Amino acid sequence: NDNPIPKSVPLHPKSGKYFHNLHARDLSNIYQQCYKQIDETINQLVDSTSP
Amino acid sequence: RDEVIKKKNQNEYYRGRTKKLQATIISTKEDFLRSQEILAQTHLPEKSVF
């Protein structure tokens, strides 16, 4: 209506290219680095405190 | 973490120096015992110097 701007259209193969390209950016390396850091911090704290 | 490891190494060579000074003071106490052994014999000056 009015301005010919449809709300949505069916997917196109050219648009399918970008749809296949779109992905959620990963945190696996970040999460594993954080886990290793906190684990080694705990291990250090195990004997760090004065007896 | 590296600085904490360095400070642990600091604590432990300080412990090594503590053991070394404990050895020094046990040696000093043995010297003190030898001093008492020397004290055992009186070496009194004569009663008639003057």
Q: In B1-50, at which residue ranges do the beta strands (DSSP E only) sit?
A: none
Instruction: Check CB contact under 8 Å for B1 and A44.
Output: yes
Nearest-CA residue of chain B relative to A43?
Answer: B1
Buried b (16+ CB within 10 A) or exposed e, B12-43: eeeeeeeeeeeeeeeeeeeeeeeeeeeeeeee
> Structure resolution in Å?
5.6
Contact B4/A at CB under 8 A: yes
The Cα–Cα gap between B31 and B25 comes to 9
Do B36 and B29 meet the contact criterion of CB atoms below 8 Å apart?
Answer: no
The Cα–Cα gap between B33 and B30 comes to 5
- Please, which experimental method was used? cryo-EM
From residue A38, alpha-carbon distances to A44, A46, B2 in Å are: 10, 12, 15
Distance from CA of A44 to the nearest CA of B (A): 8
The Cα–Cα gap between B22 and B39 comes to 25
